[model samples]
Target: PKEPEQLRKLFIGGLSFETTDESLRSHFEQWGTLTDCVVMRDPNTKRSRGFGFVTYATVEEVDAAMNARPHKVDGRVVEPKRAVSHLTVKKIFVGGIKEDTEEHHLRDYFEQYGKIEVIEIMTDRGSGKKRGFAFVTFDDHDSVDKIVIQKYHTVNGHNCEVRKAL
Candidate 1:
């Protein structure tokens, strides 16, 4: 029987500098028939803007694409999510901590810059496994500025990734 279909547009970030529209389309074509695939570029420089959009013809295909999640496609671990009509941020997303890493660990690690308002580690509700990421809120946005510039953090030997949460 033919599988049912439902198209969903996805946004892909952290693309490799060498990524091209043709490569993006080729990498994603296995997911389903692509109605549209676009990789933004600088008009003058023509370098990849470091992100792209993809539309899949079926939800099944979307699921297949997700199998590649937490997995990399072209050396760079890609970040893909359903395209939202709007973008928002401020809270910083921290990834690559050990599963057992705790909120206090985060607080202790980041408090040197300024006052931290909240340190939260996200986890799955039922299984209680650490999602391997957390959100740290600061009393001052200036603190974020201080931290982001460094762009590097290591917890328990693993290099932690920090970026403005969107």
Candidate 2:
């Protein structure tokens, strides 16, 4: 068998479709300088194909990258390795929502962030009651950062925590 190449470049996946060259580059620059930052896109639609790769000039940088845990870039949680795979979603977890909040209400609040893809309010398995939390996905993954770190995300007077969904 051929020996695997020692990785100076990493295959990154689970990127948001909205991830851009500069957005991805800016986030990873904290670790070290980069030789390249790429986000693949469709030829026709020019939409993101949801994956890309990055390269660094130093072995130490490679070491830092491969071993780094809990990695994220441009609001998308990504898994990086020496080879290829990818996914994209700007799904966020929302908690502390009012019990009476409907899916549309949740949609209305987050809609300002972007067009919504899905909204799921958790329910108790037995009682079918609201779990006080929900998951939301936006059509444009770029909307995540604008709402997530802001101070005023709420629905029905209940302040909510909009964290990236697992």
Candidate 3:
């Protein structure tokens, strides 16, 4: 998969219905260099969707734009936040897994906090042995938050560590 781009991305909301890509770009350019700018539109009617996004070349630019809010664009005040994809914290890292631990053991132990989307156990390619670590994905970001807050777990009688995935 391609590398994530949330670092310098911004989701602009409360945009005026009349806002266009040109207008949005012009409004945010004063803060810093922008990589991309768009005003979301409905495909059928090609009308403004009342929201859009802007991607800056650097995080510092994004920070400058964010700090300069409450932004007024096209006669309406707009709100900006980190782009949606990275806004939710869903994935986490799990380590200290026992050799005998299976995916079922992890599911059984972790499902209590929330619905799990995935659990990946890392294994050595050459040796084909468990790497004693895993990556877990939960449907709700809150689940990962809770797990990390606790910071400890026992899976199949083995002490394990939980942390937010980078």
C-alpha TM-scores of all predictions: 0.46, 0.47, 0.50
Stretches off by above 4 angstroms in model 1 are 1-7, 85-166
For 1-166, candidate 2 gives per-residue lDDT tens digits of 4223334566778898888888877777667678888999998999998888877766457557655645777776886654321133478889898578789889878887767988999999999999899998886544564455456676878878877665
Q: Rank the candidates by lDDT, best first.
A: 3, 1, 2
Across residues 1-38, which tens digit of lDDT does each residue of candidate 1 receive? 43332226767889987888888898889777887788
C-alpha RMSD for every candidate: 14.5, 13.4, 11.3
Q: What lDDT score belongs to each candidate, Candidate 1 first? A: 0.73, 0.72, 0.81
User: Which candidate number maximizes TM-score?
Assistant: 3
Q: Is candidate 1 or candidate 3 better by TM-score?
A: 3
Q: What does candidate 3's lDDT look like per residue over 1-166, in tens digits?
A: 4224666788888999999999999999999887889999999999999999998888668768866877999899987777543345788888888577889998998998668989999999999899889998987664665566553587888888888796
Ranking by TM-score: 3, 2, 1
Off by over 4 Å in 2: 1-89
Question: Please, what's the RMSD in Å of model 2?
Answer: 13.4
Candidate with top lDDT is: 3
Q: Point out the worst 10-residue segment of candidate 2 by lDDT.
A: 80-89
User: Candidate 2, after superposition: displacement of residue 158 in Å?
Assistant: 0.6
Weakest lDDT window of 10 consecutive positions for candidate 1: 81-90
Better of 2 and 3 by TM-score: 3
